[PDB]
Design a protein around this ligand. Structure first.
Ligand SMILES: [Zn+2]
Ligand SMILES: [Zn+2]
Ligand SMILES: [Zn+2]
Length: 457
């Protein structure tokens, strides 16, 4: 039950305006044949061009919305739209390109997909709101066959070249002209009422409709992300490592310990309200503070309202509140906050629904749109490094460190020791790693690193 059987029925009602007379009774087997492809009763890793919802969710990094609009059916030009914002016009002789024959259009498609996907996934999943022209145009830039490996590496093959008769992955596809063994899924098979725009606009106000193919491609993928990662959530699905996931996650634990420990030392809060992930552990386990946990799963739709989190019947105004990746609409003044900036560009952060983003780091977290007004009661947390550890070098070469933000006994004494200089530069790299990944740090306005110097006396 892991792959989509080709004998599964395909609802054709959405196709009958582009393809009048299409049979109501239709399987994927007959649909693929109708699209001009032949599968040959082949057991070589490619059982179906179309995939299940579950397989699509596991390969969300490969999702490319795809739409085709009749520009004027073999006799008229076609506008090819992709969720990358690209519009290509193919002739049978926000970006918008003029009409060109299929033999040059397919070269642009391979280049576009390869640059988009090489650092994201081992494949492409075309996300469709299928009405006909997009399915019948695939024969002009798609080749299928047995699963293969790249001619220059061990990755699976995603492209084919008619010039050299060879195969390549996204990384080595320069000059290739055909997409090889792509995957696809028709969102309209999921049981919607009404057209694409009416269903998309139920949940998203960020993507308009300029009535060009790329806008439909964007809305289609956006609707799919909402259905699979907003209204539905599955945190059991694991995703492969494609970047600095481990360093980013390790940096997050180190910065969280550093910031909370220093806030407790500087202001001596009697109680800390740890609001968020119900799997949370004390990040400063040796602190004397009264540590109270409050369970809140990561919100995937709208940011939590602070009124429903705190109230409905309790003294969150006592001490300090810790919101580590707990997105609320407005943080109280006595808060320590880590909030993911959905606007960040990285291979881990995919475009999301209604201004949000889909952050995929081991697991997929759809995150509500970043909002600067949520931090009005707070200020940005400045960088600093604090350590009460002994100045002792145990066991890399050294240039003396000078920094006003190395809060250690040795710097209080006027000369940073080598150990705390090593730890400072290691923490600075971790801090910059986490900030670059899109995380932002905010703190109550009274926070002052000057209060940490007298923790050495
Ligand atoms: Zn390769
Ligand atoms: Zn949208
Ligand atoms: Zn030192």
């Amino acid at each position: 039950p892991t792959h989509l059987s080709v004998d599964t029925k395909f609802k054709t009602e959405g196709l009958c305006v582009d393809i009048p007379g299409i049979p109501k009774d239709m399987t994927y087997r007959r649909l693929i044949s109708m699209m001009g492809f032949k599968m040959n009763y082949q057991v070589n890793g490619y059982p179906n061009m179309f995939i299940t919802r579950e397989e699509a969710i596991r390969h969300v990094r490969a999702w490319i919305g795809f739409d085709v609009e009749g520009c004027h059916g073999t006799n008229l030009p076609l506008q090819l739209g992709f969720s990358t914002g690209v519009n290509l016009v193919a002739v049978p002789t926000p970006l918008m390109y003029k009409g060109l024959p299929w033999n040059v259009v397919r070269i642009k498609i391979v280049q576009m997909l390869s640059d988009t996907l090489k650092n994201l996934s081992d494949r492409v999943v075309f996300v469709l709101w299928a009405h006909g022209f997009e399915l019948t145009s695939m024969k002009y830039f798609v080749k299928i066959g047995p699963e293969r490996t790249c001619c220059l590496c061990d990755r699976r093959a995603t492209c084919f070249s008619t010039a050299s008769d060879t195969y390549a992955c996204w990384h080595h596809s320069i000059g290739f002209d055909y997409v090889y063994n792509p995957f696809m899924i028709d969102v309209q098979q999921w049981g919607f009422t009404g057209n694409l725009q009416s269903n998309h606009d139920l949940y998203c106000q960020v993507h308009g409709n300029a009535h060009v193919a790329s806008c439909d491609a964007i809305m289609t993928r956006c609707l799919a992300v909402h259905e699979c990662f907003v209204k539905r959530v599955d945190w059991t699905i694991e995703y492969p490592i494609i970047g600095d996931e481990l360093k980013i996650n390790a940096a997050c634990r180190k910065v969280q310990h550093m910031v909370v420990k220093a806030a407790l030392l500087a202001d001596k809060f009697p109680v800390l309200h740890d609001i968020g992930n119900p799997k949370a552990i004390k990040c400063v386990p040796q602190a004397d503070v009264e540590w109270k946990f409050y369970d809140a799963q990561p919100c995937s739709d709208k940011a939590y309202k602070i009124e429903e989190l705190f109230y409905s019947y309790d003294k969150f105004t006592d001490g300090v509140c810790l919101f580590w990746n707990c997105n609320v609409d407005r943080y109280p003044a006595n808060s320590i906050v880590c909030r993911f900036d959905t606007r960040v560009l990285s291979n881990l952060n995919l475009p999301g629904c209604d201004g949000g983003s889909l952050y995929v780091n081991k697991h997929a977290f759809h995150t509500p749109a970043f909002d600067k007004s949520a931090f009005v009661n707070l200020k940005q947390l400045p960088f600093f490094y604090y350590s009460d550890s002994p100045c002792e070098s145990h066991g890399i070469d050294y240039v003396p460190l000078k920094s006003a933000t190395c809060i250690t006994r040795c710097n209080l004494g006027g000369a940073v020791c080598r150990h705390h200089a090593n730890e400072y530069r290691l923490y600075l790299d971790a801090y910059n790693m986490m900030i670059s990944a899109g995380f932002s740090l905010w703190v109550y306005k009274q926070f002052d690193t000057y209060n940490l110097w007298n923790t050495f006396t």
